[PDB]
Amino acid sequence: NFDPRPVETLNVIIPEKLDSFINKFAEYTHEKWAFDKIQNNWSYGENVDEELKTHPMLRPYKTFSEKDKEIYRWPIKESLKAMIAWEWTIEKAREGEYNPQPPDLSGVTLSRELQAMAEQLAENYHNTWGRKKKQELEAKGGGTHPLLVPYDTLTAKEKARDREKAQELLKFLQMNGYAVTR
């Protein structure tokens, strides 16, 4: 049985001094996506077109409106607000380390303790998805979904996407010299 309760972020305020990290990481996530698109021969085009493989977001993050940057910044803000909600500390302890070439995060090793923190983030992403999914199903007439179970009961394969998202955030924080502790 599954009763997902993602942490409540609505009144959680991110400190001003994280705004710079938020934009850098948003730019990173856009570049990564763009890089993968371009490797499959997508190119800029005014419209999204699956036959022609064009996408209007295939251009520099720097050239976006605030609305389009927000596509990438929103989910990062939601992750940071969950961490702040859980009373984790995020502090800049050290100095940090169209043709997108985003940094490679393959070589970033997270401590066991940060990997443990990634599990709480992943479970929260799963609970956010599961709560939204229950609403979506009810709005459409009812029905079910095989992943509407507690995160801990998921298979390793089923957990991967939420683990990868949680690891990417914690790796980019580390790379930019942030210590994350609880």
Ligand SMILES: [K+]
């Ligand atoms: K970019």
